[PDB]
Structure 1
Amino acid sequence: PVGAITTIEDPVLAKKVPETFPELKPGESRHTSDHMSIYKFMGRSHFLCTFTFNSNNKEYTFPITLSSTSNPPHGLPSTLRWFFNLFQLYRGPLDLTIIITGATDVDGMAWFTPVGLAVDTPWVEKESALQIDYKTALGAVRFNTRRTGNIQIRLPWYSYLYAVSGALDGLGDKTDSTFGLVSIQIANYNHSDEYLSFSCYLSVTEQSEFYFPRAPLNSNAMLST
């Protein structure tokens, strides 16, 4: 037992494989895949946010921000929050999947808006203030509650930055802390009908990368909606 004693202050010696007592090889696991492979783990699209429409012909625009500052619901919640703070830099597409709850026969549209461009005021339900032309142009998608009730489309790595991050301060934390924004606009929703709720979940893609490990958020920071 040589790895039972060392000087941790020395970066080299600290890497000495620890060993105190005599052990045997653990063996083989009974489950196929390794649940600790970030890609496979976050592969399980986790919860992001949720909102509810009140009036007809309105729209909601929620941003995808890593900001550890922005506390939910107006920010990254649960797992997603925790994860995007284990490292400093992130980049790459993200497979978003949104679930629809309640209403029916409600026509809807949604488009991804890159960071640093015109887009309806965040975390707010109001009458859109954008040219239908502009909306569509950024690449959009139409759908109807009746026919489906869920949407799984990928979100592009379209940003003027090399990467984004959550752990930041005021300034940068207001520009380099965002992937982009999503906007869902309903149509034909006579409130005489049931309520309309939306649930958004995010899953990491194979084209997604993670750089430089940070010290995980202290428990007091990990919030949940």
Structure 2
Amino acid sequence: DDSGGFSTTVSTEQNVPDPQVGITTMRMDVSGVQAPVGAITTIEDPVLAKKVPETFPELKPGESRHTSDHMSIYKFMGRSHFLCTFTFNSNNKEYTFPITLSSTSNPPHGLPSTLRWFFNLFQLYRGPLDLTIIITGATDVDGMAWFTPVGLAVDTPWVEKESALQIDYKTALGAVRFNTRRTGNIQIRLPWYSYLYAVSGALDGLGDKTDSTFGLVSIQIANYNHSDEYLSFSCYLSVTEQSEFYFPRAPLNSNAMLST
């Protein structure tokens, strides 16, 4: 033995993910003739809990009618879901919004409907994202959007104010230059910039305000505005293929799944 101990009652580590592929395909009757040993069993024994279940004479259900597997995460969360929305009001206003994976963060200030349920299904999170935003409203506004990692300084989140950060801090880290008239669309990778390894979904104390958040995107505009028309932005987050999930968690209640 490696540790010099022993084990008598059969009970070990439990709930290893991915038991089965969810698209319906054929791997005749499944049960029937033989008496069902998989109906009655011991759930207190996890080896006896992993027995092939049956209760009735069943046969092959057949195949499915869509090759697109709607039960893998990498093609399920490809549809981009809501994050936040915000409007500008005056000249050179700098807006700042984080990406706070905490379930304590009720919407709008935090995770809304689909992001709050999905990113509180699991404990650990590592990988880059995708963000899709839409320019809506007044045209010919030359703004700038940039990412800021953890540790580095940035302006106050969820607050529209004037920018207190210089342009040499903004040009050195990384941003984009675009007008509302040229292309009107942003589909951006969110870089995984942290000295810590992974981020969590539901923590407490100072670990919640530090180890749940990973990144932040803040926007300052210019040439807004001429003759009075509101400019509205809205953030939709999407997924990429370099992220992996860890420790499947009990999903949230029907109460904290708040929709916007």
Structure-2-length-normalised TM-score: 0.84
The runs of at least 4 aligned residues of structure 1 exceeding 4 Å deviation read none
Contact preservation (8 Å) 1:111, 1:136: no
Task: Describe the superposition over 1:146-167 as per-residue Cα deviations: whole angstroms up to 9, x where unpaired.
Answer: 1122211111111111100111
Measure the CA separation in 1 of the matches of 2:152 and 2:103.
22
Measure the CA separation in 2 of the matches of 1:191 and 1:212.
51
Q: CA deviation at 1:184?
A: 1.3
Contact preservation (8 Å) 1:100, 1:149: yes
Q: CA deviation at 1:3?
A: 0.8
Measure the CA separation in 1 of the matches of 2:154 and 2:39.
59
Equivalence map 1:125-144=2 (5 Å): 125-144=160-179
Residue 12 of structure 1 aligns to a residue whose secondary structure is: helix
Task: Describe the superposition over 1:81-111 as per-residue Cα deviations: whole angstroms up to 9, x where unpaired.
Answer: 1110111011111111111110100001111
Higher Cα radius of gyration: 2
Contact preservation (8 Å) 1:3, 1:17: yes
Q: CA deviation at 1:221?
A: 1.1
1:95 aligned to which of 122, 130, 143: 130
Task: Describe the superposition over 1:16-47 as per-residue Cα deviations: whole angstroms up to 9, x where unpaired.
Answer: 12111121212111111111101111111211
Aligned length: 225
Report sequence identity in percent: 100
1:44 aligned to which of 75, 79, 82: 79
Residue 49 of structure 2 aligns to a residue whose secondary structure is: helix
Q: CA deviation at 1:218?
A: 0.8
Q: CA deviation at 1:191?
A: 5.5
**Structure 1, 167-176 or 189-198: larger mean CA deviation:** 189-198
Q: Which residue of 1 aligns with 2:230?
A: 195
Structure having the larger proportion of residues in strand: 1
Contact preservation (8 Å) 1:43, 1:203: yes
> CA RMSD, aligned part only?
1.1
Contact preservation (8 Å) 1:54, 1:191: no
Task: Describe the superposition over 1:66-94 as per-residue Cα deviations: whole angstroms up to 9, x where unpaired.
Answer: 00001110000111111101110111111
Contact preservation (8 Å) 1:114, 1:181: yes
Structure 2: 5+ residue stretches without partners: 1-35
